[PDB]
Amino acid sequence: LIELINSKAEIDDIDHLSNRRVRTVGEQLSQQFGVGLARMARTIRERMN
DNA sequence: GTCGTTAGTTGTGGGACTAAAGGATATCGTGAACCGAAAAATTAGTGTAACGGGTATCCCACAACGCTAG
Secondary structure, three states: OHHHHOOOOOOOOOOOOOOOOOOOHHHHHHHHHHHHHHHHHHHHHHHHO
């Protein structure tokens, strides 16, 4: 950031395709599964409690 | 030296963002036990047939002439 302030570096490009990532079907389903399994684990922990 | 004033920020908050059509969604986690309420189902108990006159109505059939003599 300091090097950027002295006009010695470059600003990142928001629309660059290396800076735009693709969330595929597998990733979205994995994230939703993680949410569901976290809820299930909380329920299991409380039931054991 | 100290206190109120004014203007120019600066951060923060509230309010706008064509028209036409259409218009489907999915929605966790659980603690027990007894009493009261009303809504529902099951059970217990009584019964007619023809007759007298007299008369209201119905259907059903028939009549409602023609001639002669005292």
